[PDB]
Amino acid sequence: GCITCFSLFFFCNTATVYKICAWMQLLAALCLVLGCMIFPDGWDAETI
Amino acid sequence: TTVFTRILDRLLDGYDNRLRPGLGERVTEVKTDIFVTSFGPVSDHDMEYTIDVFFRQSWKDERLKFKGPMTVLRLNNLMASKIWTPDTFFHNGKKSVAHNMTMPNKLLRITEDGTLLYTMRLTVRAECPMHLEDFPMDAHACPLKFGSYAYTRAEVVYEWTREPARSVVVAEDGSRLNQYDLLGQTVDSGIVQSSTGEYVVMTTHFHLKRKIGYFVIQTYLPCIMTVILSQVSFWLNRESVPARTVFGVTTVLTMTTLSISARNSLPKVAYATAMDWFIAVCYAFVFSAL
Amino acid sequence: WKDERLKFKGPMTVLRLNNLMASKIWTPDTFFHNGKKSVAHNMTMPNKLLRITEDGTLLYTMRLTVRAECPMHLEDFPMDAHACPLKFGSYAYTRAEVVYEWTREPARSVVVAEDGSRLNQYDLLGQTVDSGIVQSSTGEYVVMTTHFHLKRKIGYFVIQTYLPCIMTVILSQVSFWLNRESVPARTVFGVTTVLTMTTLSISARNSLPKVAYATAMDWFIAVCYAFVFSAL
Amino acid sequence: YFLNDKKSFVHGVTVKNRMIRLHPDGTVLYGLRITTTAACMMDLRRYPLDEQNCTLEIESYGYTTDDIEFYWRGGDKAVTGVERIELPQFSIVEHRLVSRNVVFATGAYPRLSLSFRLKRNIGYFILQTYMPSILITILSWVSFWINYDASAARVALGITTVLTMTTINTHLRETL
Amino acid sequence: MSFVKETVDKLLKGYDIRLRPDFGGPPVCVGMNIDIASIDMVSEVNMDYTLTMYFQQYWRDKRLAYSGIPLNLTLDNRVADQLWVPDTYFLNDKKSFVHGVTVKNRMIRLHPDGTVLYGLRITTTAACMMDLRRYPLDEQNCTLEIESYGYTTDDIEFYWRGGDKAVTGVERIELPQFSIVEHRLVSRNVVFATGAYPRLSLSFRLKRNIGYFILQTYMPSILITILSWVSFWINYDASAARVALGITTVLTMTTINTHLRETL
Amino acid sequence: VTVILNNLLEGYDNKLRPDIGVKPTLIHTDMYVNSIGPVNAINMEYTIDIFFAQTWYDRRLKFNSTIKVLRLNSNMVGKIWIPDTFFRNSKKADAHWITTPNRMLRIWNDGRVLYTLRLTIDAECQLQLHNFPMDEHSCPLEFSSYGYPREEIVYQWKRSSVEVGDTRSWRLYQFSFVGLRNTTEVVKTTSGDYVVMSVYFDLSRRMGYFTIQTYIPCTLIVVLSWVSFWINKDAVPARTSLGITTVLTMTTLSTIARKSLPKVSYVTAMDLFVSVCFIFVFSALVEYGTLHYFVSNCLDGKDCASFFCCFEDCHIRIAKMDSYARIFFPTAFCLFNLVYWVSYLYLG
Amino acid sequence: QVQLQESGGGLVQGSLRVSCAASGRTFTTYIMAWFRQAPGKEREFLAAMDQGRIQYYGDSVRGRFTISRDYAKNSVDLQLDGLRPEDTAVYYCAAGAGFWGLRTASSYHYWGQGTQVTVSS
Ligand SMILES: *[C@@H]1O[C@H](CO)[C@@H](O[C@@H]2O[C@H](CO)[C@@H](O[C@@H]3O[C@H](CO[C@H]4O[C@H](CO[C@H]5O[C@H](CO)[C@@H](O)[C@H](O)[C@@H]5O)[C@@H](O)[C@H](O[C@H]5O[C@H](CO)[C@@H](O)[C@H](O)[C@@H]5O[C@H]5O[C@H](CO)[C@@H](O)[C@H](O)[C@@H]5O)[C@@H]4O)[C@@H](O)[C@H](O[C@H]4O[C@H](CO)[C@@H](O)[C@H](O)[C@@H]4O[C@H]4O[C@H](CO)[C@@H](O)[C@H](O)[C@@H]4O[C@H]4O[C@H](CO)[C@@H](O)[C@H](O)[C@@H]4O)[C@@H]3O)[C@H](O)[C@H]2NC(C)=O)[C@H](O)[C@H]1NC(C)=O
Ligand SMILES: CCCCCCCC/C=C/CCCCCCCC(=O)O[C@H](COC(=O)CCCCCCCCCCCCCCC)COP(=O)(O)OC[C@@H](O)CO
Ligand SMILES: CCCCCCCC/C=C\CCCCCCCC(=O)O[C@H](COC(=O)CCCCCCCCCCCCCCC)COP(=O)(O)OC[C@@H](O)CO
Ligand SMILES: CCCCCCCC/C=C\CCCCCCCC(=O)O[C@H](COC(=O)CCCCCCCCCCCCCCC)COP(=O)(O)OC[C@@H](O)CO
Ligand SMILES: CCCCCCCC/C=C\CCCCCCCC(=O)O[C@H](COC(=O)CCCCCCCCCCCCCCC)COP(=O)(O)OC[C@@H](O)CO
Ligand SMILES: *[C@@H]1O[C@H](CO)[C@@H](O[C@@H]2O[C@H](CO)[C@@H](O[C@@H]3O[C@H](CO[C@H]4O[C@H](CO)[C@@H](O)[C@H](O)[C@@H]4O)[C@@H](O)[C@H](O)[C@@H]3O)[C@H](O)[C@H]2NC(C)=O)[C@H](O)[C@H]1NC(C)=O
Ligand SMILES: *[C@@H]1O[C@H](CO)[C@@H](O[C@@H]2O[C@H](CO)[C@@H](O[C@@H]3O[C@H](CO)[C@@H](O)[C@H](O)[C@@H]3O)[C@H](O)[C@H]2NC(C)=O)[C@H](O)[C@H]1NC(C)=O
Ligand SMILES: CCCCCCCCCCCC(=O)OC[C@H](COP(=O)([O-])O)OC(=O)CCCCCCCCCCC
Ligand SMILES: CCCCCCCCCCCCCCCC(=O)O
Ligand SMILES: CCCCCCCCCCCCCCCC(=O)O
Ligand SMILES: *[C@@H]1O[C@H](CO)[C@@H](O)[C@H](O)[C@H]1NC(C)=O
Ligand SMILES: CCCCCC
């Protein structure tokens, strides 16, 4: 979505789009951290 | 012990299975009855229906009398095929199956007095002609008719073991119908005068009534709502020419789609059903609104 | 064929045998190489006839419903043509043991009935009759081959598929002749012609064998769809 | 045997539905109960306003007229039950019987033929295939009574009528 | 190899197929095993399901006991036509067959103590009553009922060989539409006037998968309804736009409904 | 020669395998695949026609003579011992009996028996239809002796194990025959341990029909949905009709996505592509609806409201939503296609 | 309209034949039956014949009355033999698919005028 929001650089003010990707990348990083922390929790599975 | 094998070996001595019991001096009387384990699907496309039955007949053959400590004698299928049994067949059958898994699903018991009891497990597809004038509001009486193929009325006569109503017993769980409801059975007997002679025909009639809720929710109600949209066209201001034209023509297209879908899932009938008349009137109403 | 063991003499000249006795005599183990589930009719009785001439010549006639494989390459559908084969020969006996031949000249030994064409889709142009040898791990086998040439009928697809697609494309191009200010009207042409082409494409593809490669009709429909999209 | 059959079988429940009846004079009656699918070449160019002509041919496999002859016992009353037939989509207009010797080059072979002339019933098609097409064609003429300037209305009407005809044709191709 | 030949010939010499093991004695106990190769089809219309299995029956026959050959004699399956075997049959069956390629998929194995193992590869269509009022959110229950046609409990008795582990291969079954939540084995004696007849019952509980209907039925309808709500935000005077949107949403819902009617 | 056959059949018990007490009976198997029939993905099965040949040794059938080989039709096949071979994953299999039984039996003087027959098998193949129509499968055909465990019958593959014909005369509509392989395993059952052998045929689906029929039309419908963004605002009937009728066209197109497949309860690649395109057209229509509605009517630098969340003015600029959607929608669709196609072709 | 005309005698000292001709609809697939009503208002089943040419009879008139159908003419005939004084009644011709019936008048939708029969000794 941020790579898509690179398109907004034509019209919108540069600062607000930079902040939009900033918040979007921060949220993406938070999701990636949550995934990496939750993934070892599932190692108890009978297949694993 | 030796008594069983001796009686089994000595029963068929001089027995001619080409001749019916009491040939030329009496009429072979067959007491028959049926236990319907499941009233199979009814295919209105093919005008047929499947039925699984424990079909058991009984008669008397004095040629097979015997004496011993035992009053009942079980015959294996090889020997059961070596003696005369009725040539019962289903008049309106299309393709019936005698079950053979794991061994022939039939049994033959003999009493010391010569009474034979012959039980079979069968799956019979039978013709059910249908009057679809009042479809989907219609009801039918699908028949199941059987009798001797070769022996006329003066040689073999079939009868019901018990009262005819109680001689065809349907299992409580044995109603495998999606479209219909099995209201009940009517058991009867009659005579057919064929080109070869008179024959006794034992008949059952299973009474079926089609369920209507599916056609109400799928066809009647959406068609009525489409028509109601067609009259709702009238309440828009007359100056909305493109709006009302689009409304009418797209309502006609919707009605056409509904008609196609309604008929696509139905048997290929020539004359018109009640569903067809309702759909045609709905066409007329949307067309007249436009 | 000829069987010296079955020679007989008498007032007769031809003696026909019933099925029980015919099953007690060697007959060729002919089978159809490209065959499938095939039927040997026995209504009311086995449709077979074995006859022996006084000099041991056996004639064996059967009535069969052969279901045979016709490999089809439907790239040119519906303008395609095919040569459906019918190959047969001995199963167990190699070329050194059993050899097949045609009773007459090869062209005249496979005779098609005048009114036997039960074809709806195709037209039977003709037949080609030949013979050959097929190699195998077991050995060489004689194979008698026929090839029936079939040409598909095009008129149904013309009236049902090609003509409505062409007319839809013409309708899409008709939008160019209206004034530019009729924006809803020309939008309605464009999108409804797209929807009509979609419906026609789905219908045309529905009644066609489920091949994963593109046929000629698929290319025609794709180009028409592109034309309608371009008009919009 | 039946020359034009494709798949036939004698019914076999509860036993093989055969009948042998010997008469004192020596006459033998041999009865079978047979369900047979028989080929019928149909000319459907006038479909659904078409009459079909379906026959059953009965021949001897390996006997000529000097060894066996066929005839229809009872004459025209040989075949019964046709009057009691009501097909879902056809109506049997007439049935005919003919006995003849096919003069094949080796020798003459007997043959019987039972023909039926079916006539298709059209109320289905009239009520369902012709009526909506006629109504949609009539609705397409409504555009002529609308003003020229009303572009959106006339265009929507015409193109949606075209779409409806396309839908009818495609789905009728699928169903038929 | 010869000594086996005389031993087998002696066993089959004088054998009476008509007489069960211990004809005058107690009932012969017949254990049963099933190995489910596959559950092929589940027809809601016909209300049945197809099932391929290796069905094995174990019993004891003193007539077939032999000594001097310490190994189990796996005989050609044709010998099954000469030996007595139970008259088992599947009560809720509609159409079944024992496979026949390359030879009849049948097994006879004798044991030195007289134990007979009799195996058959059977594909059976079995009727299964279905209650589809909650379809596609329905949990069906489909069973196979095994019974003796002629013999009552005095003559024959059934049991599941290995107990709850008698039927195997259920966990390896994959069904695209269903998931086998669990299976159960029951052994009982149905009581009638004639007598108590033994019966075994295999049962499966099938949970219909919902994802197919989520993607094909529910999400399109929800999205089309949400689009139909868009008219409320369009201006009142835009009659052509709002009417076109509403009537085309109605047409789209009709199209979805009819297509689902055809495919399902 | 009849004397030889009569002598061989004398004192012969076909119920007993050769070497019943001595050693396992070794069998050498060969297959010639005439045609791998169509792959029926609905029932998860595929048809295959084979010439199946088995070679073994029978000491009882040794004969001393100058003939050195007896070549025979099916007549004696029932008179001798034959292996109990059956196909484990065969839903339905049939032999061939027209004109006569399609079987062959050859017996050499040293006791070697070769037994060949033609078979048509409808073999089960559980297809994992993820990545459809980019899916590839390796459908097996397994067989083993029904009754005889590994200690009694052992199969062995020969050098020319499985042979194939042209492979252009085969009935494969959807797939292309990629390759072949053979394997031997020992499978434990309640009866015992059995020498199972499998032949895996590798198949890959063709995408030409799916490319022409659903991928390209769905993409074009998405582009036509984008065309609404260039239509002038206040052309309300035109834009509304365009959006909703493109939605209807996607609804029509999505029907044929699953016509070939069974009712699997997971999203295939085709389903995902169609779903994403549907969301794209839905989003275009919702975008126009929103635009029309809103137009008709401590030490880093500063603080946690100006160094982040833009709470100084921001909505205001909604009139330019078409300008954003003109480039946002093609960018989102192009990025989706780049991740979509790279994922299903190269990474996995 | 669908009508079922009846024809036959009304007086006999005897043997009689009562015919029934149906007009307005083809009853080839329907069951055609005869009913009797003596004075006292009680309707009695006599005979019925099916599309399969299967003849059902009532116990009171089994072996005496014979029912036949001419499907080409779309008519049903009843031959009455061994008449008695107690057989005097009005005879009705009926047609209709036998639902819950084949022996009950409620299952028949079509009926005719009826024909009077009297026997004097
Ligand atoms: C419940 O009930 C069902 C039956 O309703 C039962 O199923 C039945 O099982 C039996 C086996 O137990 C099975 O019988 C055998 O069939 C073999 C031949 O094929 C027959 O089937 C094929 C195909 O059938 C399948 O078709 C479909 C799939 O393709 C589908 O419906 C099914 O899957 C079905 O199985 C069919 O094409 C054949 O048609 C004919 O050709 C045969 C050629 O061999 C011939 O035998 C048949 O009679 C028949 O020919 C007549 O009909 C045709 C037209 O159809 C006419 O053209 C002919 O002129 C004839 O009129 C068959 O129907 C067959 O090989 C087996 O025969 C052998 O049986 C034993 C074997 O040891 C011997 O006692 C026999 O003698 C015989 O063996 C001899 O022949 C073979 C073949 O050459 C040799 O290899 C042997 O060495 C041996 O040779 C010796 O003896 C002969 C004399 O006998 C001598 O001449 C030789 O020189 C030599 O000395 C056997 O008959 C039956 O088909 C099947 N019925 C079905 C399914 O419909 C269930 O099992 C029951 N339930 C349970 C669970 O038990
Ligand atoms: C303005 C101009 C005026 C024009 C005039 C308009 C007139 C309005 C027409 C009404 C049609 C009446 C149809 C009723 C026909 C009689 C059918 C009937 O007896 O009702 C039940 C069927 O319905 C059913 O359950 C199926 C359920 C259908 C109802 C579903 C709720 C829809 C809610 C949406 C609103 C609906 C109302 C709108 C009407 C315009 C019978 O089944 P039952 O129980 O015995 O056993 C279970 C079942 O599975 C077997 O029947
Ligand atoms: C394989 C994956 C493919 C990835 C492809 C991704 C492509 C995604 C789509 C469009 C990108 C659009 C980029 C447009 C950037 C053009 C920005 C521009 O015009 O220049 C100025 C600088 O902006 C800026 O510093 C912002 C810098 C933007 C940088 C983003 C573009 C770089 C793309 C380089 C491609 C590398 C690929 C290599 C992959 C291995 C801003 O203007 P301006 O002052 O007048 O406005 C002020 C106000 O008053 C009115 O706008
Ligand atoms: C409104 C005015 C009134 C018009 C009234 C006319 C109405 C519409 C026309 C015809 C309807 C007749 C029914 C259609 C019948 C089908 C036509 C037909 O029979 O001829 C076919 C020719 O195919 C073929 O050349 C294939 C070609 C089909 C015709 C189309 C090709 C030219 C399209 C160029 C695009 C221009 C775009 C316009 C841009 C300005 C085959 O026959 P042939 O004997 O060989 O048997 C071969 C054997 O396989 C069975 O057919
Ligand atoms: C062409 C159409 C256009 C595309 C459609 C629009 C795009 C929609 C976007 C994302 C959703 C995609 C979902 C894809 C399907 C997901 C299906 C799935 O895998 O999850 C299921 C769970 O369902 C579940 O608990 C769900 C249980 C049902 C709960 C009700 C859900 C209805 C929605 C609730 C309101 C949401 C409001 C938001 C509205 C926008 C698993 O169980 P199921 O047995 O199947 O596995 C059998 C397994 O065991 C076989 O091995
Ligand atoms: C196609 O139709 C043919 C007839 O139109 C079918 O041929 C008939 O096949 C059945 C069984 O398939 C035969 O009936 C059986 O015969 C066996 C053997 O009997 C013979 O052997 C005994 C003992 O050696 C001997 O005593 C007899 O006289 C025979 O020589 C027995 O088990 C029973 O009798 C059983 O009825 C018919 O006999 C046979 N017809 C004729 C005229 O022989 C053919 O099977 C059909 N094709 C199929 C089903 O695929
Ligand atoms: C002939 O067949 C019989 C019957 O299958 C064989 O008897 C059985 O052989 C199995 C396998 O060795 C035995 O299983 C085992 O049981 C022991 C003791 O419980 C356990 O320690 C092992 O781990 C294994 O689970 C089984 O007990 C035995 N007896 C039965 C089933 O009654 C026999 O061995 C076979 N003989 C030959 C020569 O193949
Ligand atoms: C079938 C494919 C056809 C593709 C044809 C694309 C031609 C578009 C050329 C754009 C011309 C242009 O720059 O003027 C339009 C606006 C300028 O803003 P405005 O003042 O006109 O509202 O410009 C913009 O602000 C955005 C213009 C759009 C740029 C992105 C185009 C991507 C097209 C690829 C579609 C697959
Ligand atoms: C449930 C979603 C339906 C689709 C609605 C699309 C058009 C929505 C436009 C914006 C709605 C929110 C604005 C609220 C402002 C107000 O109070 O009116
Ligand atoms: C121009 C905007 C759209 C961008 C997406 C373009 C790609 C459309 C997908 C076309 C299907 C291509 C099929 C690739 C697989 C193949 O042909 O082997
Ligand atoms: C089949 O197996 C044999 C022996 O195991 C081997 O030589 C041959 O290469 C195999 N076939 C293949 C890999 O295609
Ligand atoms: C300008 C010509 C466009 C053609 C589209 C196929």
Radius of gyration of chain C (CA): 28
Q: Residue C190 and residue F170: Cβ atoms within 8 Å?
A: no
Q: Which helix (H) or strand (E) holds F37?
A: strand F25-40
Q: What is the 3-state secondary structure (H, E, C) of B184-197?
A: EEEEEEEEEECCCC
Task: Please name which of B285, B18, B10, B13 lies closest in space to residue B151, comparing C-alpha atoms.
Answer: B18
Apex F235 CA angle, F229 and F240, nearest 5: 70
Q: Which two tokens stand for residue E156?
A: 């024959």
**One-letter amino acid identity for E36?**
I
Q: What is the DSSP letter of F105?
A: E
| Subunit contact D84:G72, Cβ cutoff 8 A | no
The structure tokens listed for F41 are: 């993905």
User: Which residues does chain D have within 8 Å of residue G53's beta carbon, measured at their own beta carbons?
Assistant: 84
Count other C-beta atoms under 10 Å from residue E197's C-beta. Answer: 19
Tell whether ligand 9 has an atom less than 6 A from the beta carbon of residue F209. no
Q: How far apart are the first and last CA of chain A?
A: 34
- Which of C45, C203, C207 to substitute to test the interface with D, most D CBs within 10 Å? C203
Cβ of F156 closer than 6 Å to ligand 1, yes or no, is no
CA distance E113 to chain B (A): 22
The single-letter code of the amino acid at B201 is: V
Q: Quick check: B101 contacting E, CB < 8 Å?
A: yes
Backbone angles phi, psi at E48, to 5 degrees: -150, 180
- Asked if B261 and E262 count as a contact pair (C-beta separation under 8 A), the reply is yes
Strands B115-127 and B97-98, by their bridges, are: antiparallel
Alpha-carbon span D56 to C49, nearest angstrom = 22
3-state SS string for B192-248: EECCCCEEEEEEEEEEEEECCHHHHHHHHHHHHHHHHHHHHHHHCCCCCHHHHHHHH
Mutation target vs F (from C1, C75, C91, C180; most F CBs, 10 A cutoff): C91
DSSP count for chain A of H helices, then E strands: 2, 0
Q: Is the dihedral of CA D94, D95, D101, D105 positive or negative?
A: positive
Chains in contact with D via at least 3 Cβ–Cβ pairs below 8 Å: B, C, G
For ligand 11, say whether the CB of F157 is within 6 Å of any of its atoms. yes
Between CA E157 and CA E169 the distance in angstroms is 25
Whether G3 contacts chain B with CB within 8 A:
no
Which residues 53-72 on chain B approach chain D with CB closer than 8 angstroms? 55
Q: Which chains lie within 8 Å of chain C at 3 or more CB pairs, if any?
A: D, F
Chain F residue nearest residue C223, CA to CA: F212
Task: Give the span between the Cα atoms of E146 and E198, in whole angstroms.
Answer: 9
Gap between the Cα atoms of F316 and D16, Å rounded: 89
Residue pair F146/F86 in contact (Cβ under 8 Å)? The answer is yes
Scan residues 72-131 of E and list those with Cβ closer than 8 Å to F.
Answer: 74-79, 99-103, 105-109, 117, 119, 121, 123
Q: What is the dihedral of CA F167, F169, F172, F175, to 10 degrees?
A: 40
Tokens, residue B38: 């499941």
> Which technique was the structure solved with, according to the deposited record?
cryo-EM
CA–CA separation, B249 vs B226, rounded Å? Answer: 12
> Is D99 labelled a binding residue?
no
Size of the C and F interface in Cβ pairs below 8 Å: 154
Angle between helices F269-296 and E219-228 (to 10 degrees): 10
Search chain E and give the residue with CA nearest B49: E46
Q: How far is D28 from chain C (nearest CA, A)?
A: 16
CA pair distance C136, C140, nearest whole angstrom: 6
Q: Which residues pair with F115 in a beta bridge?
A: F54, F105
**List of long-range contacts for E159-165, beta carbons under 8 Å, 24+ apart:** E159/E29, E159/E30, E159/E31, E159/E32, E159/E187, E159/E200, E160/E31, E160/E32, E160/E33, E160/E185, E160/E187, E160/E200, E161/E31, E161/E32, E161/E33, E161/E56, E161/E58, E162/E33
Distance CA G108, CA G97 (A): 7
CA distances from C19 to F29, F347, G50 (A): 36, 66, 43
Neighbour order of strands in the sheet with G3-7: G3-7, G16-23, G75-80, G66-70
DSSP state of F345: I
Burial of E25 (0-12, 13-18, 19+ CB in 10 A): exposed
Q: How far, in Å, are E16, E70, E112, F15 from residue E63 at the CA level?
A: 9, 17, 11, 18
| CA C128, C133, C135, C141 torsion-angle sign | positive
The reported resolution of this PDB entry, expressed in Å, is 2.9
Amino acid in position B48: E
Identify the residue whose C-alpha is closest to ligand 11 atom 1: F182
How far apart (Å, rounded) are the C-alpha atoms in residues B230 and B228?
A: 5
Positive or negative, the Cα torsion across B20, B91, D95, D38? negative
G 5-24: CB under 8 A from B: none
Whether residue C185 and residue D170 make contact (CB cut-off 8 A), yes or no, is: no
- Which DSSP string do the residues of F242-310 spell out, in sequence order? HHHHHHHHHHHHHGGGGSSS---SS--HHHHHHHHHHHHHHHHHHHHHHHHHHHH---SSS-TTTSSS-
Identity of the residue in E102, E211, E245 whose CB atom sits nearest the CB atom of F244:
E245
